[PDB]
Design a binder for this molecule. Structure first.
Ligand SMILES: C[S@@+](CC[C@H](N)C(=O)[O-])C[C@H]1O[C@@H](n2cnc3c(N)ncnc32)[C@H](O)[C@@H]1O
Ligand SMILES: C[S@@+](CC[C@H](N)C(=O)[O-])C[C@H]1O[C@@H](n2cnc3c(N)ncnc32)[C@H](O)[C@@H]1O
Ligand SMILES: C[S@@+](CC[C@H](N)C(=O)[O-])C[C@H]1O[C@@H](n2cnc3c(N)ncnc32)[C@H](O)[C@@H]1O
Ligand SMILES: C[S@@+](CC[C@H](N)C(=O)[O-])C[C@H]1O[C@@H](n2cnc3c(N)ncnc32)[C@H](O)[C@@H]1O
Lengths: 247, 247, 247, 247
């Protein structure tokens, strides 16, 4: 299959990546160098045109460059670890809230058998849906435009849960009840205060606790001057993991 | 889903995790405290017995505590990112060599639809099969006890490839040939020397180059004394990613 | 400059450093390889005997390998930054408490013109003096065996202060008074809880606030296999810096 | 002593530091907020006016915000560790080249008793002098405008050396000869290629080898949302340290 028009492509030029829809007679220009989308439409993946390499985007590239952000997203750095740390596969059901823009959801969807997501704000609920539908994702996802505390969530049936909210300690009882015995949970908390607060509240519900931070550092890809890049993302969030306690 | 005899359990006591097979009359003793396995048979996951929390192990815990190591392994820190970075799902076929102890393979197998894996050393080839089989994994894996260079491999059948060998640059042409157009490739390299050498020749075959290292720092999960651990894994390997260029 | 009987030497063997007194008739053995100290005495610095390289220790090696530890110490990774971040030189007077084992003191002493140090525990007060004198350090230091709250400290004579105690917020007013206008202050705090607590109480005393953590990753020094070490120190403490606000 | 006109002051407003010369009638605007210098002149350090805190700058702030950069500089993160790692004090003479903009020099000058620095490029030689002079530094520094290879330097008179050039391996024999027995040496190298090459070259001249990289992560200083900053400096350089081997 060759490059069709109207489809989103990943363009590499120098150190930088670009995501662009292949619309006729439109172009990408970067520092005097021009790539015309008309020369791309009809070519295979991995073509080199005037210094521009063109491919179809991966899941990581789709999330980072394709997804509209109406809220703070969970980056692949974290979500690629989270999905598999939650011990997910195609035999498993996972609970997520809040959906936000669907950045974590896209990864949970790709790994798990079934996802139930909850998002209180209607705008973000529509945005996450749009994001995933746009890139052919989320066919195993049930979206709910409701506050998790008000939702009717089937008790004792989820193989895992992941919580991304400001104050997750207000939802611990219900999350606990939604899960199967011994099931993994994960929490995303940007702040140390939130983590301390969650650790104060979690003891009745989840054991085998783990808190981890993930750092990625990229390197220059030039052979003769191999070294780390000048800057890196320093922090996205503390990741909190546990396992359901019987009670 | 209560604990049955002979099955593997993950035990947490204090800061430590233990993986133990549930054998009759046998026990686990740490710092005086004893956990008798007869007392855990018939109990649900997330039961707490004498300060010991017991669960079934996750994929990460299986790899780290359960897999027999005849070689250096690829750690979940890296492999969880690798599997999804390579854009894998159930519709994808992935190439891997060398199999080694099967630690990366276990993750590839869970994420991908199909894996072809090559290991030249017979005892490593046997250990990898034993590792995954012991934990009910690798049902979608084709194991080959041959040097990849001698293998009969149809061209353009792989949606992704991952290479973990001392000198990957010798295999670039065959891997490129075995991949479908524009397909992701990844390389595991422990030393900067290897990365530098790979970067000399790689651009004849693969573009959209990325080199990243992944660091995990774990935290004390005590609410009142929240802080990072004393020590961490500093380095496992440099990860280099690319995409098949059309030749 | 030849090695004398009884002096402390830094011995390097393979990847490892050793600090030893040059005692006659004595030896160091590592992996069945033997260094005889009689062969070292009377030799120049930087001799190599039986694979062992022998030098006089530096400030960092003295603190790390030579100082007796009765308390948690401040490591050179932090202390080398701290002393210069506090803007110390030979025309500066610095306040420090608690002295502990004198590990930070050694650095403050080397950089600043004079140091007033306070330690409430007399066993620790004595150990710190023993450490420093043993290695010909601390001639510019006034040691006090007193609680800092009870100490007779002249107001406005200190160019900087550093506080290493469990609950530094109790002593803010007195440290503030002891400091010259706009003078730098630093705090060492192992936990996030402690930093959060100091930050809410420091508001009316110190401004230009900074919190930093310092990570050192070491590398293999083998040319053909250049890569980071397997393990590193993950955390020592958060460092909090401010400047005296005029009240 | 209150602020005088013509003084360079450190101004803190929100998260940002500013270094400005106190010019009468002049101001600093941060968006719509204004600080009038006429209100600062005649006031003590640590004064707060309309949200702006004003101090005199420390060595770190002088280097980072005050020094004119005509080369790549060595940052305080590295130089503060370097100066004390080289075991410098007021009884030590240190060799340095190339001087560059004088950022490392300022620190060596503050710590050592005497510095001999060499810079081949006349412009940078003048820049380094102008930088230190402007902030009342470097009175113990001998500046030379010459290639180190061509300079007449007394044998065995340096207690330490630091080398910041592209290819330091060329100067090893001379640096070695200029050093006292057992003396520390340091090298700054941006790339792994350079480190690899130096390690290949250094074996006959320097032992007790160490390679380290230093990372600083800064934190939000808001009590109720304590977390690391979003971004950090990922890499400045690899730091190589050794000790003179007897030849
Ligand atoms: C930081 S965003 C989640 C980002 C998401 N993980 C991603 O990767 O894009 C937090 C979201 O949770 C939603 N939320 C907060 N509390 C909720 C609740 N009680 N029930 C359902 N959604 C909630 C908010 O509306 C917000 O959109
Ligand atoms: C470091 S181990 C791989 C570890 C594995 N990735 C894991 O996670 O457990 C590398 C293995 O590749 C094998 N190997 C090297 N070259 C090979 C080749 N050309 N074909 C097949 N196997 C090869 C070696 O026998 C060795 O066991
Ligand atoms: C962690 S140790 C300091 C270690 C020291 N910075 C070093 O490098 O070796 C803390 C010390 O502070 C002392 N201390 C606590 N409160 C004090 C106070 N109010 N006045 C004097 N010393 C105090 C304790 O006795 C203890 O020795
Ligand atoms: C990276 S800059 C030095 C930066 C300096 N360490 C600082 O902190 O500002 C390298 C300098 O070394 C100088 N240089 C290179 N080779 C030299 C040599 N053989 N003798 C003297 N200077 C040399 C260059 O002119 C250049 O200014």
């Amino acid at each position: 299959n060759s490059f069709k028009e109207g489809e989103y492509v990943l363009i590499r030029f120098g150190e930088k990546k670009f995501l662009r829809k292949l619309l006729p007679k439109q172009s990408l220009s970067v520092k005097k160098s021009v790539l015309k989308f008309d020369e791309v439409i009809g070519k295979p993946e991995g073509v080199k045109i005037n210094g521009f390499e063109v491919y179809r985007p991966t899941l990581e590239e789709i999330i980072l460059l394709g997804f509209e952000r109406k809220t703070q997203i969970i980056y692949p750095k974290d979500s690629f670890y989270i999905a598999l740390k939650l011990n997910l596969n195609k035999e498993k059901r996972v609970l997520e809230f809040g959906t936000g823009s669907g950045a974590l959801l896209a990864v949970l969807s790709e790994v798990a058998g079934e996802v139930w997501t909850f998002e209180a704000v209607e705008e973000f609920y529509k945005t996450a849906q749009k994001n995933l539908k746009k890139f052919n994702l989320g066919k195993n996802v049930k979206f709910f435009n409701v506050d998790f505390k008000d939702a009717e969530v089937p008790e004792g049936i989820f193989h895992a849960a992941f919580v991304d909210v400001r104050e997750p300690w207000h939802y611990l009882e219900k999350v606990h009840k939604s899960l199967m015995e011994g099931a993994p949970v994960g929490f995303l908390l940007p702040t140390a205060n939130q983590v301390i607060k969650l650790l104060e509240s979690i003891e009745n519900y989840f054991g085998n606790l783990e808190v981890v931070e993930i750092l990625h550092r990229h390197y220059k890809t030039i052979s003769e001057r191999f070294r780390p890049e000048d800057q890196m993302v320093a922090h996205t969030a503390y990741l909190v993991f546990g396992r359901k306690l019987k009670t």
